[PDB]
C-alpha cells in the first residue's frame, strides 16, 4: 500500500520536473518561435503595406 | 489547473486519510 503512495510521488515528481521543463520550454519554444516568426510577418506586412501605399500614390499620378 | 486537479486529489485524500488515522489513533483508546 505505501508503495502506491511512493509510486505516486515518483511519477508526480518525475512529471513535475518533466512539466516544469515542458511547461516552460513548450511555451518558450512555441512562443519565441511565434513572435520571432510573426515579428517578421509583422515587419514584412508593414513593408508590403508601405510599398502598396507607394504603389497607390504612383497610380494616382499615372 | 491540471497540476492542481491531481495535487488536489492527492492532498485531500492524503490529509483525509492522515486525519482519519489521527482521529482513530486517539479514538481507539
Amino acid at each position: 500500500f505505501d508503495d502506491i503512495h511512493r509510486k505516486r510521488m515518483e511519477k508526480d515528481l518525475n512529471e513535475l520536473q518533466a512539466l516544469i521543463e515542458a511547461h516552460f520550454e513548450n511555451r518558450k519554444k512555441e512562443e519565441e518561435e511565434l513572435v520571432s516568426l510573426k515579428d517578421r510577418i509583422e515587419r514584412r506586412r508593414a513593408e508590403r503595406a508601405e510599398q502598396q501605399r507607394i504603389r497607390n500614390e504612383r497610380e494616382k499620378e499615372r | 489547473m491540471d497540476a492542481i486537479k491531481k495535487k488536489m486529489q492527492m492532498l485531500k485524500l492524503d490529509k483525509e486519510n492522515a486525519l482519519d488515522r489521527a482521529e482513530q489513533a486517539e479514538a481507539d483508546k
Partner: protein, 375 residues
C-alpha cells in the same frame, strides 16, 4: 488492426457510447448514442445523402436531421439503430470486427432482462461475435474505483442505480433504482432557460442545452446560499455561446438544474434525492456491513463530475448517518468513463474467461441464454 483476440468493451448508454479494447485503461473513442435522419425534402440532384447518419455524423449534419437515442434510460429498444452505432464504433473507430473478438457490454443490476437478451442476440446474429458477456455496471464501477465493498452511485444520463456490494456480493434488497438522471437535467434546463427568455424545444436546441449543462453547471455544497447570491447578483452568472452566435447568460439555473439530483421535486419526481437513496441502501444492510459501506460511497457516471457533488452528498449522508462512524465519498478523476474501465478490468481477468457465452451455446439455446450464463 489488433494483434490479439482481445475482448471488445463497450458501454452503450442513453447518453454516450464508450469503446475500446480489453486491457486498456480508457475507451479509445467516445461519441453520443445517436442515429439521425433528415426531416426535409431534398431538391438538389447528385448530393449523395444518407437515409440515416451515425454518431458524430449525426451531429455533424444535424442542421436538417432529427436525432434519436436507441437506448431509453438504460434499455435498448431501437436495436436497428444500435446495430449501426456498434458497426460504426467497431469498424470506423476501433477498426476491429466483433467476428474476430469476444464482446463485453454492460447494464445496471435491475435493468429489465430484455436489454441483456437483445444485446446478446444482435452481437451473435448480425456481427457473428464468437462470444458474449453482459456485465453489471455496478461491478464494473467498483472494479475501476478499486473496491470490493461500497455503494455504486452511477448517476449518469439514463438512470441512477444506487447498489450496495459487500466483499464482492450483492445486497439486492437494498438497491434503490431511481428515475432521476442526467437526461432529465437536460430537459429541465431547457425549461428553466425558457423562463429566462431563451426557449429550447427542438433537437438542435436540446443538443445546445446539453452542451450548456456539461460546460456551465455545478451543484454547490450549500444550495440555498448559492441560490440566494445567484438570484441577487451578476457575479455568479456565466455566459454561453450558442452555435449560431447567440449568447445566453445563465444565473441560478446553472445550479438549480443539477440541484434536482438532491431535490427531484423540481422535475415532479417523488424522491428524497440521491443522498437519501445512498443512505437508505446502507441503512437496509446489516450493521457489520454499514461500517464499510458508509466509508465507501463510490461515484461513477456523469453528473458526479459537478463541482460540489461529492461534498454535497457526503454532507447529507453524514447528516443522516450516526456519529463516531466515518462517512466518505470516493470520486476519482476517472469519472463518467470509469464503467468502461471496469469493463476492461473484467474482460481481461483470468477468472472471467469461463464466464463467456460462446457462439455454440448461443445458437443451441437462443439469446435467453444470457439470463443464465452471465449472472
Amino acid at each position: 488492426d489488433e494483434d490479439e483476440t482481445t475482448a471488445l468493451v463497450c458501454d452503450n448508454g442513453s447518453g454516450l457510447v464508450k469503446a475500446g479494447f480489453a486491457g486498456d485503461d480508457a475507451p479509445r473513442a467516445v461519441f453520443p448514442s445517436i442515429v439521425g435522419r433528415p426531416r426535409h425534402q431534398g431538391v438538389m440532384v447528385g448530393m449523395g445523402q444518407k437515409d440515416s447518419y451515425v454518431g458524430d455524423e449525426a451531429q455533424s449534419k444535424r442542421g436538417i436531421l432529427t436525432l434519436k437515442y436507441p437506448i431509453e434510460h438504460g434499455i435498448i429498444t431501437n436495436w436497428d439503430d444500435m446495430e449501426k452505432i456498434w458497426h460504426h464504433t467497431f469498424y470506423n473507430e476501433l477498426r476491429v470486427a466483433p467476428e474476430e473478438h469476444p464482446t463485453l457490454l454492460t447494464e445496471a443490476p435491475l435493468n429489465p432482462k430484455a436489454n441483456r437478451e437483445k444485446m446478446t442476440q444482435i452481437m451473435f446474429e448480425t456481427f457473428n461475435v464468437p462470444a458474449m458477456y453482459v456485465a453489471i455496471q455496478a461491478v464494473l464501477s467498483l472494479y475501476a474505483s478499486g473496491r470490493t465493498t461500497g455503494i455504486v452511485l452511477d448517476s449518469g444520463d439514463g438512470v441512477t442505480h444506487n447498489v450496495p456490494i459487500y466483499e464482492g456480493y450483492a445486497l439486492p434488497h437494498a438497491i434503490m433504482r431511481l428515475d432521476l438522471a442526467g437526461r432529465d437535467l437536460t430537459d429541465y434546463l431547457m425549461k428553466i432557460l425558457t423562463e429566462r427568455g431563451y426557449s429550447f424545444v427542438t433537437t438542435a436546441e436540446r443538443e445546445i442545452v446539453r452542451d450548456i449543462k456539461e460546460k456551465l453547471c455545478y451543484v454547490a455544497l450549500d444550495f440555498e446560499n448559492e441560490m440566494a447570491t445567484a438570484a441577487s447578483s451578476s457575479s455568479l452568472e456565466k455566459s454561453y455561446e450558442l452555435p449560431d452566435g447567440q449568447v445566453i447568460t445563465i444565473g441560478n439555473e446553472r445550479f438549480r438544474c443539477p440541484e434536482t439530483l438532491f431535490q427531484p421535486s423540481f422535475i415532479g419526481m417523488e424522491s428524497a434525492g440521491i443522498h437519501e437513496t445512498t443512505y437508505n441502501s446502507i441503512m437496509k444492510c446489516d450493521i457489520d456491513i454499514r461500517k464499510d459501506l458508509y466509508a465507501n460511497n463510490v461515484m461513477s457516471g456523469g453528473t458526479t463530475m459537478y463541482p460540489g457533488i461529492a461534498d454535497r452528498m457526503q454532507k447529507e449522508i453524514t447528516a443522516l448517518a450516526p456519529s463516531t462512524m466515518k462517512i466518505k465519498i470516493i470520486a476519482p478523476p476517472e469519472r463518467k468513463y470509469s464503467v468502461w474501465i471496469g469493463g476492461s478490468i473484467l474482460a481481461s481477468l483470468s477468472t472471467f474467461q469461463q464466464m463467456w457465452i460462446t457462439k455454440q451455446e448461443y445458437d443451441e439455446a437462443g439469446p435467453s441464454i444470457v439470463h443464465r450464463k452471465c449472472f
